[PDB]
């Protein structure tokens, strides 16, 4: 199997500060039921550059939140990543349905 191509792209925004900021990043979403986090928009085809954040929705299941902000996204499921992401926020309220519209309809070939 390997011909999963992207369903949504768009930034959201993850905690990364001594207080308590958010920042956005640009996280790419697959049909595979996986979407990968990056700090900028790197593309280039002569140094490819690896993922930053990898979130996964393949198994368990995600929350929609409104805390500290409106619109978020929250999780309870670790198996094996780099970052511990629970929560993260997206950059508007069309945004977040967006995400959650596309891991219901890529849940269907998922299973």
Same mark, same amino acid.
């Given at each position: 199997? @390997? *011909?999963?191509?992207?369903? +949504? #792209?768009?930034? !959201? =925004? +993850?905690?990364? *500060?001594?207080? +308590?900021?958010?920042?956005?990043?640009?996280? !790419?979403?697959?049909?595979?039921?996986?979407?990968?986090?990056?700090? *900028?928009?790197?593309?280039?085809?002569?140094?490819? !550059?690896?993922?930053? @954040? @990898?979130?996964?929705?393949? *198994?368990?299941?995600?929350?929609? $939140?409104?805390?500290?902000?409106?619109?978020?996204?929250?999780?309870?499921?670790?198996?094996? $990543?780099?970052?511990?992401?629970?929560?993260? =926020?997206?950059?508007?309220?069309? #945004?977040?349905?967006?995400?959650?519209?596309?891991?219901?309809?890529?849940? @269907?070939? !998922?299973?």
């Amino acid at each position: 199997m @390997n *011909e999963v191509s992207v369903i +949504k #792209e768009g930034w !959201l =925004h +993850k905690r990364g *500060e001594y207080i +308590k900021t958010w920042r956005p990043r640009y996280f !790419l979403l697959k049909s595979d039921g996986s979407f990968i986090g990056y700090k *900028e928009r790197p593309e280039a085809p002569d140094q490819t !550059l690896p993922p930053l @954040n @990898n979130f996964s929705v393949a *198994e368990c299941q995600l929350m929609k $939140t409104e805390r500290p902000r409106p619109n978020t996204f929250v999780i309870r499921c670790l198996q094996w $990543t780099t970052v511990i992401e629970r929560t993260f =926020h997206v950059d508007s309220p069309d #945004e977040r349905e967006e995400w959650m519209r596309a891991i219901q309809m890529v849940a @269907n070939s !998922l299973k």
